[PDB]
Design a protein around this ligand. Sequence first.
Ligand SMILES: Cn1cc(CNC(=O)c2ccco2)cn1
Length: 171
Amino acid sequence: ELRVGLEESELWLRFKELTNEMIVTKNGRRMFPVLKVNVSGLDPNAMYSFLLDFVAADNHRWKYVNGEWVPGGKPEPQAPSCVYIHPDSPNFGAHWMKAPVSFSKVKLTNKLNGGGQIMLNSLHKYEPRIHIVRVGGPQRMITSHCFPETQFIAVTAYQNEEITALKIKYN
Ligand SMILES: Cn1cc(CNC(=O)c2ccco2)cn1
């Protein structure tokens, strides 16, 4: 059985209990914490690409009102985010299983842009998701996994100073 686990869940949960925020910029900002995933049960000899996307967790716009995040009343359907291909892709199962798979180079933007960067809507809430795609073999297969612990709201600047403090303390 293919097993997907979150590395450093301890720390993600401190961010989540405060409501996590991730900065987006026109050029694209790297994430902290970085999503790092433990994977076991791949075929060491099979070929895989690791893909990352962001599910809109709800259909609403969020605002930080009197020290508290609150959703708008006017949902709109959220078109799915673009997919980020891990730079190590494509690679053997052994490669992916020898150390946590770290998405350190993904950049989150608010503007449709050249390449690499993933465009999110500011003040929407997102749930990171990976796809593990068996490639080059005869039998294409996909395994997907969500990480509720890594939910955040996309912001152009931090609203909750308790987030600002955690980000610095642990970077
Ligand atoms: C780092 N990098 C690798 C590619 C090639 N593409 C892939 O591996 C791919 C696309 C869909 C599933 O897998 C593009 N960027």
